[PDB]
Symmetry: D2
Subunit: 180 residues, 4 copies
């Protein structure tokens, strides 16, 4: 059994992903040409996009990562999450760029954004591969967006179903029998 | 003789060499706060805190490693329903020294939102790091954040931070014992002592 | 959203009986501290407590151990299948120094199945500890799922659920200065 | 004022890397066709290679990451490191595939490999982008290797100099003036 056999439809092809990442990287490269920002990804979903985005971003930058976990309901309410791994370097006075795979409710990411401002970040911006604005549970707008999607039930290029499918080179929708 | 090495985040290794009959007490010039004084103080503070937190189940949090002995003795003299949690942090270097911002190595196991937080500490001096943690808990929407410290050096402050409860105000002496260390040793003393100058240079 | 009612409720009202009183605990902690101090005369051990329950006992025991030593702490969490059957746990907070060449003394609240503790002991051996020993306040050896004998033990207890002195029931009671048994009416799961 | 200006010479081009990654991905997809392994990346340097390698690995897999920090001398002489972020799932009985940017001394990686075997891993294999066997301080052989290199003084594609240059899409050598 092969993975493509579980995909009902490719919603965004690899070619489309590659073209958009080239575009976003040039845009971000120009916006931060002056000062080296701290590019941060939240594990695990953001990893593939961050890697390709940053490699298409011709400007000095530092990479870092955080890992967090849910606290149950305060996470599904305020976005507060337990920090499992904090950044390797200080946030104060740095220009932060959060690299995300998808923004739906926006809760956890909003929490992290305002955490970085509490930590006195010079600025905080977000670049997300996919955005789902109809999902918002807080007011949070991404500064850079690859693709605006109608729903979050997709897999690939970082997105998983039961921890699998993150490795697909495109973004697709699963066949119903896979999850039901 | 005996020796070992440990990690030190301001070097990053220290090698420690001990003589077979060296004893902690001989390194102490004088006892500053005896165990008996400490027992009496935690008894008094615990009854006070038990009264102040009578209507709520607070989350008492200790900042590892130094707060552990005081937190254990204080909480067992605090006769009220409460939960315990712990945090571990790491310095970012010159930037922690000047802002208080630290790396979270171990975050709380439960959420801060809507909780009455009681932070238990061993000593407050510059107050930078503790202040960072207090306002972190407020950013996390705690209902209230209070601090109880065994020792306070309030004129050493680099930020405004008044502890809600303090065991003893300490003057001009470098102390160890009851959680406080010198190169990771002495934390296990049951009293607070003044370390002989020859030990630290 | 959350409302709390304690009224003038006190924890003692929830305790059917005090199993090990504060006085009993302090006398045994003092004896243990003296034995450990003697056993560890010739070395500076790394005493490690496993959060959260071991803390009250660790504080009192080390205060009664008159010998040079370093303290450290670890935090761990379950994986759910391999933990239940092999003791493997996720490390949430590792030690702040290396284990290589150290004499490790693991301070514990109670040992029941001993699966996680066994995992940690052998982890420390893999990390090249010079020695690994265990001191536990309580021991429930009838409950074992692996062969693991503590090197130092305070009290052997039956296979019954207890609280106090670090031990909790739904995150409460850790602050009691004794080990007690809850009234049946108290535990609604 | 651009990163390329700090690069004395491209050792391994983006094109050479993309071609090698395609070849490794196919080999790995084939070797692990029967069971979904746990693909683990050690932050931070392994991230770009891991993302592009797995993307070219057409088989079911789960991704995970670890974060580690030095303890000082013990790290330097035994590879023992402080775990800052452990795996999100258990190792017992899983086939582990560690993805690395470079293996030089091999000390820490050997430590993590034998840690996974202590954790009862069904098997542990390593895929590295770069290999420098002349630099070994323990006998550790990668199962899969992108390129063998004489020395480790290189940047790009995850490899850094003072936390910068990780985002270059190729592997290069810095000009002397960059590190004085
Ligand atoms: N051991 C010891 N530490 C001190 C003393 N005075 C200040 N400190 C250090 O100051 C640290 C926290 O103080 P702050 O970050 O508020 O300045 C403590 O960890 C403590 O080690 C002292 O007299 N003895
Ligand atoms: N509160 C409480 N916890 C217990 C009791 N017995 C076992 N435990 C829990 O189980 C752990 C030891 O279980 P083991 O891993 O040895 O099977 C203890 O650290 C504690 O968390 C008990 O009687 N009371
Ligand atoms: O399934 C893709 C679907 O999305 C659309 C409409 O939302 O494209 C949207 O997102 C693009 C990404 O920026 C925009 O360029 C476009 O303007 C916007 O409509 C459709 O193209 C398509 O049906
Ligand atoms: O309320 C008593 C309580 O206050 C503390 C500070 O938290 O000490 C203050 O009050 C004492 C007398 O009431 C003074 O002697 C002391 O100098 C002052 O700081 C605690 O130590 C005490 O438990
Ligand atoms: O920069 C390439 C460099 O590597 C060498 C040896 O250092 O050859 C390596 O690369 C080959 C191409 O993948 C490998 O097949 C081979 O195993 C490895 O030795 C040199 O030829 C070259 O200068
Ligand atoms: Mg400070
Ligand atoms: Mg167990």
């Amino acid at each position: 059994a092969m993975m493509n056999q579980d995909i009902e439809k490719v919603l965004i092809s690899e070619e489309q992903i590659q073209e958009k990442v080239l575009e976003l990287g040039a845009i971000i490269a120009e916006d931060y040409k002056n000062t080296v920002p701290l590019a941060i990804g939240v594990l695990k979903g953001a990893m593939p996009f961050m890697a390709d985005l940053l490699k298409r971003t011709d400007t000095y930058l530092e990479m870092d990562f955080m890992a967090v976990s849910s606290y149950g309901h305060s996470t599904v309410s305020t976005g507060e999450v337990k920090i499992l791994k904090d950044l390797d370097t200080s946030v104060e006075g740095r220009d932060i760029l959060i690299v995300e795979d998808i923004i739906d409710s926006g809760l956890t990411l909003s929490y992290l954004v305002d955490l970085f401002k509490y930590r006195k970040a010079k600025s905080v911006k977000i670049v997300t591969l996919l955005d789902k604005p109809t999902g918002r549970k807080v007011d949070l707008k991404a500064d850079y967006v690859g693709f605006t999607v109608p729903h979050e039930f997709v897999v690939g290029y970082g997105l998983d179903y039961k921890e699998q499918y993150r490795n697909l080179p495109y973004v697709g929708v699963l066949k119903p029998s896979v999850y039901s």
